[PDB]
C-alpha cells in the first residue's frame, strides 16, 4: 500500500507567516491527493482536494500544489485559529485503499506569557473518600516548557504527582496545566504546609503557591 | 444543513463486540458514498472501511472479517458493527460523507466517538470542588477534579454551556490506578464569585453518571 | 467465404465510454479465434468457462462483442464477481459469464496533450447494475433530501466524470481498451462457428 509522509513532523510559527507543509507519495498517485485539518478534539475539516482545489467556506490563505510524489499545503498568512494537526491523503487506487500521512502539528509562535499560579487544598467531600488530592494550576502562559516542583513540609514530592497540558488555545495562543497531587488522607494528616513552586520562562523567580492544612 | 452525529461507542471487551451508529441529516446515507475512519489516541488517521451508494463495502485489510459497514435508510444513520474487538482497535472513529469526483475525499466528518477496549470494568467519577480560597488576586480560579473513571470520555460543562469563557478542561491522565481523573477548571473575576452561580456538569455515559456540582 | 467482423470491433478508431458500453451482434459467420488467440499487442486474456485453447473448435448461436475504454487499474473491475464504480455502475459481468475479456493499453492511441476528457464514467448510481445492463441517463443525482431540478450543486451532482487521460499519466491512469466476446448460446442452431 502507498504510504504518505507528511514533512516537518511538528512546526512553529508567527502570526501573518507563510507556512509551507510537503507530502510525499511513495508511489505516483497523480494528483489524487487531498488536505485535511483537525483541532484538539474536532472533527477533522477537508480542506483541499484534487491537488489543489479549495474545498468551499474554507479561507483563501489555505491553498495546495503538486503533483505525482511531491505535494505543498501553504497557508499564506498564519492566525491563532490555524493551530492543528494537518493530514494529507491519498486516493489513487481505483478501489479505496485510502492512506493519510501521519500528520503535521502546527503550532503559533507569540510573546512570552507568565502564567498565573493557583493551588486547591483536597476537597473534604473528597477527604471522607480517604483520599487527599492538591492541584496546581498554571494558567495562561507560553511556551509550553513549565516546571512544577511540588514540596510538603519543603520535602520535594517524587512519583506520587501527575501533570495534564491544554493544546495551544485558539485566541491568545497559550497552554494551561493541571498538577495533581495524591496523598493517603492518613499521609496527609502527616504534614502541615503544601506548596508547589513554578519555574517558567516568563517568571523572574520562581513563584509558590501554598497552603496550611486546616488553613 | 448538514451534520453527522456518532454514537454507541464505550468499552467492550477484548474479542467483544460493539455497534456504532452515525446518524446523518442533510444527505441521505442511501445515496451516498460512506466511510469509517479511526484515530489511535495521539496517532494518526486510519482509513477503516466505506460503503458504496449500490451497497458495494470495502474494508482496510487490518479490519477484514471482524468489521461490517451497513446502512438503515428509514433511520437514515451508517453503521459499523465489530466482533472480536482487539486491543489496537481502540481509537476515536469518525464517518465521512465521501464525494468520487476528483478521487474519493471525505468533505463533511463526523465528529468522533470513542472505542475503548481492555479488560477493565467501567467506573463512574467521583467530582469533587477545586474551590478557591480567599486569598486565592484580581481574578480566582475554580473548578472540578472528576476523579477516579474508567473509560474516557467524560464531557464537562459549565452552567449548562452558559459560562465557555476562561474555561481549561485538561485531558485526563490514567493513574497509577489504571483509572482515569481529570481537571476543569475556569478563572474568573473574582467580584463575579458573588454575582454568578458555578455549576460543572459533568456526565460519564459509560456509566451514565450524571452529576451537576456547584462549587464554593 | 463469410469471416466475422472481429476487425470493426478491435481496430475500431473509437471506442465508447464504459457507461455507454457498446454492442456488436455477431450472427451468421465462421469466426477464427485464431487471429486474437495468438497475439502480441494484448495485456489481459482471460477466458471463463470456455478456454481459450477451444475457442476455434467450439460454437454459439451467437456471440456479443462489446467493446469500451477504461484505465488500466480498473480492467481487473471486468471480470465476475468483481466489485468497484466500474463493475457496479458502468459494465456488469454475470457470475456465470462464459466468455473471454481481451484488453489492451491504447496509450498512443486515446490520451493528448492537455487531456482526452471524452471517456466518460458513472460515479453515482442509486443500484448496481445488473449482468449486461447498460445506463445512458444523465440526470443530476440527488444525494441529498432536497430535490435538484435539473441544477448542480451541493448534494446534487452529475453522475458523469470524464477520465482524463494523458500521455504523461502512470501506466495505472492510462486508457486500456477493452473487448468482452460473450458466448450465447441456446438451442436455435448455431450460427457462428469456426475453421472446423
Known sequence: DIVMTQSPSSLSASVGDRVTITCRASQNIERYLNWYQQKPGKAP?????????????????????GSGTDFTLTISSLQPEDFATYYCQQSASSTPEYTFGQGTKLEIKRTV??????????????????????????????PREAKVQWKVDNALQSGNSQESVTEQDSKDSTYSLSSTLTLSKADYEKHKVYACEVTHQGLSSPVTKSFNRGE | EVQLVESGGGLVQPGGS?????????????????SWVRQAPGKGLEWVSVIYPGGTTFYADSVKGRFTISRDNSMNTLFLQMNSLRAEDTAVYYCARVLPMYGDYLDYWGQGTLVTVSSASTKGPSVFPLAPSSKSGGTA???????????????????????????????????????????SVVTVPSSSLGTQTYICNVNHKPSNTKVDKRVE | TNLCPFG???????FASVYAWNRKRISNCVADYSVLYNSASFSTFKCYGVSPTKLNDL?????????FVIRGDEVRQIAPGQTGK??????????????????????????????????LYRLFRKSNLKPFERDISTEIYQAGSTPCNGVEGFNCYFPL????????????????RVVVLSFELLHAPATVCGPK
Open chain 1, 45 to 65: 475539516k477537508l480542506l483541499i482536494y484534487a491537488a489543489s482545489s479549495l474545498q468551499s467556506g474554507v479561507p483563501s490563505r489555505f491553498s495546495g500544489s
Open chain 2, 18 to 34: 460493539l455497534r456504532l451508529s452515525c446518524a446523518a441529516s442533510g444527505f441521505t446515507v442511501g445515496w451516498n458514498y460512506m
Open chain 3, 8 to 14: 470493426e470491433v478491435f481496430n475500431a478508431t473509437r
Open chain 3, 59 to 67: 460454437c454459439f448461436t451467437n456471440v456479443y462483442a462489446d467493446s
Open chain 1, 113 to 142: 506569557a507568565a502564567p498565573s499560579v493557583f493551588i486547591f487544598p483536597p476537597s473534604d467531600e473528597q477527604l471522607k473518600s480517604g483520599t487527599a488530592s492538591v492541584v496546581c494550576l498554571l494558567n495562561n502562559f507560553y
Open chain 2, 141 to 183: 480560579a475554580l473548578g472540578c477534579l472528576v476523579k477516579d473513571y474508567f473509560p474516557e470520555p467524560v464531557t464537562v460543562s459549565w452552567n449548562s454551556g452558559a459560562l465557555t469563557s476562561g474555561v481549561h478542561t485538561f485531558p485526563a491522565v490514567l493513574q497509577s490506578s489504571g483509572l482515569y481523573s481529570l481537571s
Open chain 3, 86 to 119: 466500474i463493475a457496479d455502475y458502468n459494465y456488469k459481468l454475470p457470475d456465470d459469464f462464459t466468455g473471454c475479456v481481451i484488453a489492451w493499453n491504447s496509450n498512443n492511441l486515446d490520451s493528448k496533450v492537455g487531456g482526452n476528457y471524452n471517456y
Open chain 3, 161 to 176: 466524470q470524464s477520465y482524463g487521460f494523458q500521455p504523461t499519466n502512470g501506466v495505472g491512469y492510462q486508457p486500456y
